[PDB]
Amino acid sequence: HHSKEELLKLTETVVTEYLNSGNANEAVNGVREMRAPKHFLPEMLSKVIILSLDRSDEDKEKASSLISLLKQEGIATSDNFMQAFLNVLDQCPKLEVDIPLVKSYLAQFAARAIISELVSISELAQPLESGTHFPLFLLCLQQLAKLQDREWLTELFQQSKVNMQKMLPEIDQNKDRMLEILEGKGLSFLFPLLKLEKELLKQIKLDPSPQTIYKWIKDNISPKLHVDKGFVNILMTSFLQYISSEVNAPSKEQLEQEKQLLLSFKPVMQKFLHDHVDLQVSALYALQVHCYNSNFPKGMLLRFFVHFYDMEIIEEEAFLAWKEDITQEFPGKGKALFQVNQWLTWLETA
């Protein structure tokens, strides 16, 4: 016959003493002596969170530890934590009035609960989709990275299968805006190829020295992504965009400049492409799309094929594999094949 207010008052005492002593044994004892009904469990947990919110970072850590302990002891469940967490989230506007940093603080609780296996990233994404509470979801990610590491967070985020763009407010739901927001939260590391796509051409223009470009890639892209087909697409596309922006049937002078520019970038291209037929195919697709965007100017695609072959950027087998590859992810394959088919036949038959 115990009321809601009695049990909340009892909860408050347990919290005050745990924050003082860090008594795992006595906190559990306190909660057990409460003999709280199962229906009060979520209310108890949300009280634990709210009592701690406007206290120190250290007291917040202690409150999260208490929650985890109650689950470990079978006093409450992951489901009870989720109920409780959602109940606090719903009060976010009210709490923010008196606790201006409440979102950042709530993000601390979410991060620690995920770490202790009380809630998943994929679950957390559900009530937060489309920028609910926003930037709360991103602040949870911030805290995860800080408490663990970027490699851990990157793979957990990958495992969650959450679509990051879908987590943004609707008016922000665009790849370019997404990158702006993530960079501002210190979360750019989650989308390195998107960041590459937006920055690489700018970087080449800034300092086109082959050594600088290579070192920039080494610094900003993982060795594993160096062998990723998407990376190669962006790499090649960026070089080609640079070349054509500087060089523009063309004059003898334009053709020579174009060749000299390629000759300067060749060692960088070779460093990533050598001994990777699949990547060399992806590089040909990048070339295909590049020429496609200029309506396949007379002889352009073919002259680049010839350069790629002669400069040992692309080996014979990749040219033939490109022709055979069935992808329709890239426009202009039929028009592309029309231009280069005789040259390819020549490689095979002459």
Q: Report yes or no: 167 and 129 within 8 Å, Cβ to Cβ.
A: yes
| Alpha carbon distances (Å) from 82 to 14, 41, 92, 162 | 21, 11, 15, 18
Q: Report yes or no: 185 and 139 within 8 Å, Cβ to Cβ.
A: yes
Q: What's the one-letter identity of residue 86?
A: L
Q: What's the one-letter identity of residue 219?
A: D
Domains in the chain with CATH codes: 1-190 (1.25.40.180), 191-350 (1.25.40.180)
Resolution of the coordinates in A?
A: 2.0
Residue 222: count of CB within 10 angstroms of its CB: 13
Cα-Cα-Cα-Cα dihedral sign, residues 70, 71, 75, 78: positive
> In angstroms, how far apart are the furthest CA atoms of the chain?
96
Which residues lie closer than 8 Å to 40 by C-beta, 6 or more apart? Answer: 4, 7
Element holding 98 (H helix, E strand): helix 92-98
Q: Report yes or no: 88 and 49 within 8 Å, Cβ to Cβ.
A: yes
How many Å apart are CA 305 and CA 316, to the nearest integer?
Answer: 10
Residue 263 tokens, joined: 């000759």
DSSP line for 288-338: HHHHHHTT--TTHHHHHHHHHHHTTSS-HHHHHHHHH----SSTTHHHHHH
Element holding 342 (H helix, E strand): helix 333-349
Collect contacts of 211-220 with beta carbons under 8 A, ≥24 apart: 213/265, 213/268, 214/267, 214/268, 214/271, 217/268, 217/272, 220/192, 220/195, 220/196
DSSP 190: G
Residue 35: count of CB within 10 angstroms of its CB: 9
Q: What's the one-letter identity of residue 160?
A: S
DSSP line for 216-266: HHHHHS-HHHHT-HHHHHHHHHHHHHHHHHHH----HHHHHHHHHHHHHHH
In the numeric block, the tokens 């967070």 are attached to 153
How many Å apart are CA 69 and CA 172, to the nearest integer?
Answer: 39
DSSP line for 151-181: HHHHHHHHHHT--SGGGS-GGG-SHHHHHHH
Residue 134 tokens, joined: 């926003």
Our measurement of the distance from residue 266's CA atom to the centroid of its chain's CA atoms, rounded to an integer in Å, reads 30
Q: What's the one-letter identity of residue 170?
A: E
